[PDB]
Amino acid sequence: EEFRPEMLQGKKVIVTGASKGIGREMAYHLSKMGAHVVLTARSEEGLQKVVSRCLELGAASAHYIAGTMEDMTFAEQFIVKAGKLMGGLDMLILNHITQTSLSLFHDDIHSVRRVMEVNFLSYVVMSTAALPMLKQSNGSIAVISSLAGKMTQPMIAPYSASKFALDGFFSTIRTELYITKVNVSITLCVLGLIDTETAMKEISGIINAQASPKEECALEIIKGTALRKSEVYYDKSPLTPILLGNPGRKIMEFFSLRYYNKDMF
Amino acid sequence: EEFRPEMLQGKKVIVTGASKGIGREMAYHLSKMGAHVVLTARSEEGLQKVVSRCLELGAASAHYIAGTMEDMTFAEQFIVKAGKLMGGLDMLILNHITQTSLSLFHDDIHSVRRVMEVNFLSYVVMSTAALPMLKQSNGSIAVISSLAGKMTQPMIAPYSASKFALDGFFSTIRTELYITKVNVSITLCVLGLIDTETAMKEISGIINAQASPKEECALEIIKGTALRKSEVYYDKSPLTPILLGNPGRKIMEFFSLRYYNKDMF
Ligand SMILES: NC(=O)c1ccc[n+]([C@@H]2O[C@H](COP(=O)([O-])OP(=O)(O)OC[C@H]3O[C@@H](n4cnc5c(N)ncnc54)[C@H](OP(=O)(O)O)[C@@H]3O)[C@@H](O)[C@H]2O)c1
Numbered sequence A, B: 001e002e003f004r005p006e007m008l009q010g011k012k013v014i015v016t017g018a019s020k021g022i023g024r025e026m027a028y029h030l031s032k033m034g035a036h037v038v039l040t041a042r043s044e045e046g047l048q049k050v051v052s053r054c055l056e057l058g059a060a061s062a063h064y065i066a067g068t069m070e071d072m073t074f075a076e077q078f079i080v081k082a083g084k085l086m087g088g089l090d091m092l093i094l095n096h097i098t099q100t101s102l103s104l105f106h107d108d109i110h111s112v113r114r115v116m117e118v119n120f121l122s123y124v125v126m127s128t129a130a131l132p133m134l135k136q137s138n139g140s141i142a143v144i145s146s147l148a149g150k151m152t153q154p155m156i157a158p159y160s161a162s163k164f165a166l167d168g169f170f171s172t173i174r175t176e177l178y179i180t181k182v183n184v185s186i187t188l189c190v191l192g193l194i195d196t197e198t199a200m201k202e203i204s205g206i207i208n209a210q211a212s213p214k215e216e217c218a219l220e221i222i223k224g225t226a227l228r229k230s231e232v233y234y235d236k237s238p239l240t241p242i243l244l245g246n247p248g249r250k251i252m253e254f255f256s257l258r259y260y261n262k263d264m265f
């Protein structure tokens, strides 16, 4: 199937980490598509600014809920308030991440605990809290990851862990949903370097690599999620999907089901 | 290069989850090899029994420290007491896991936090706490994972997440160690279905597949770790390493280093 921006006309969509970066570019894109949007981040001020440009762009409705995804209760509550506000949920975009600086891992157990709580746990809390509305609407989940969630690079050990943890968790859910004949899709978005101000500031004096436009990235995420693709690759190199694709895993995963007692699902 | 049991004669080795299963079989194997051993699990009684058979088998010294790896302070303290007790550390075997039952994921969030703390966080705490002794001894770390830490299967979503999180974290550490010319090796052990009573009980009425011997598994883990192999695959099928090997990732990981400022190391 080929994408049409009409696929998101009047659809109820949640976007995390929407104050800046890819989250913001996705909000703007959904707006132009005529969708109902609910945004989140910590900065109330930041959210207000994008929520204003959202309606200005063509959003069917635009609202925001400020808060920290470090707090699991907020993550669960944000989903319910947003579900009420839009009268259901069609697409859930899981984008937010806690601050990460590129440094060779020395210690800081609490930094690693924060990373897994924000980057990983909140995503499971939020997806669990959203799954009934998504079940009704036969909707989707966009799980934002990176190349570092499919492969290893130095100076991002806790970050890689959180992104790998998502792959394990959500790919399992995706299979479970499929085998229990539930039409809710899970789209894992594997991204390369994106030209967001935050990344550029963080790689300055460490990584040489060329970034990709945040506008084209955001659109590709929405496109793939709506087109109900299991995984979406967006990087400067055209070999990234061939190299990171893991067909062997796909084969292995398929035959695993053969050993299961069919009564289980 | 080929393995010789003399490679572990007089070596100071830590084993987690040593009261039963693969942990226990590894303790016994190290004992027969003439190594100094320190074991852990929650059951004081269980540990005593294996620590007795350990000396009886030929262990250079055998000690135990009971406790829950759910407690991050214990995890770091266990490593220091054990380091004192053996007068250093050569090999650190990270084996323990919190209880997991095969069920399609619903809403047990506190159980996911539990799985991530035990199965993943304690491993990072313990490896961080052990790394200086390992740096001095030019030693190794054995990170016990499964096929489910390289690929996806239904009914083990939080478990897969924790095992994928280890892959991301430790493979990063391995690269960091290598680039900073530190001779401490990280061996990720990817295992298939093993003859442990615990596994056998958990798959009953869900998975009908052939298990592998816990004795040959444990030995293969010690063998690979000592031979300083990056990853060790142990499963009934001989195609499991070709299928789960991910050469594309290996390629990608190498070229990533090209974009880094070498002086940062
Ligand atoms: N940028 C890249 O080059 C790149 C590359 C590959 C993959 N990715 C993935 O793309 C996604 C988006 O990245 P980005 O470039 O948009 O990054 P970004 O500019 O740093 O955006 C992060 C967003 O999350 C919010 N946030 C941060 N901490 C939070 C917390 N504690 N609770 C709630 N919200 C929080 C931020 O707002 P507040 O600070 O106001 O809270 C912001 O809106 C991430 O999942 C990232 O892993 C990015």
Ligand SMILES: NC(=O)c1ccc[n+]([C@@H]2O[C@H](COP(=O)([O-])OP(=O)(O)OC[C@H]3O[C@@H](n4cnc5c(N)ncnc54)[C@H](OP(=O)(O)O)[C@@H]3O)[C@@H](O)[C@H]2O)c1
Binding pocket: B016, B017, B018, B019, B020, B021, B022, B023, B040, B041, B042, B043, B046, B067, B068, B069, B070, B094, B095, B096, B097, B098, B099, B118, B144, B145, B146, B147, B191, B192, B193, B194, B195, B196, B197, B198, B199
């Ligand atoms: N068995 C298989 O078929 C299989 C297959 C693939 C991979 N693996 C991997 O192999 C490793 C060993 O598995 P196994 O078969 O030996 O399992 P097992 O028989 O269940 O052993 C688990 C061990 O961890 C200890 N433990 C459990 N909860 C703990 C906690 N809260 N704090 C500290 N220690 C705790 C247990 O002792 P206490 O209960 O007394 O605390 C026991 O000694 C695991 O990492 C597993 O992922 C196993």
Ligand SMILES: O=C(C[C@]1(c2ccccc2)[C@H]2C[C@H]3C[C@@H]1C[C@@H](C2)[C@@H]3O)N1CC(O)C1
Binding pocket: A099, A100, A101, A102, A146, A147, A148, A153, A156, A159, A191, A192, A193, A194, A198, A199, A202, A203, A207
């Ligand atoms: O995931 C990202 C982008 C980031 C990064 C940038 C270079 C190297 C590792 C991580 C940026 C810096 C940190 C970690 C992570 C996420 C964001 C932006 C965070 O601020 N990449 C690019 C690579 O291909 C996968």
Ligand SMILES: O=C(C[C@]1(c2ccccc2)[C@H]2C[C@H]3C[C@@H]1C[C@@H](C2)[C@@H]3O)N1CC(O)C1
Binding pocket: B099, B100, B101, B102, B146, B147, B148, B153, B156, B159, B191, B192, B193, B194, B198, B199, B202, B203, B207
């Ligand atoms: O990791 C394991 C063994 C276990 C399992 C058993 C079948 C399916 C999934 C998980 C056993 C049951 C649970 C989860 C996990 C670890 C142990 C033993 C735990 O008690 N496998 C075998 C597969 O190839 C990877």
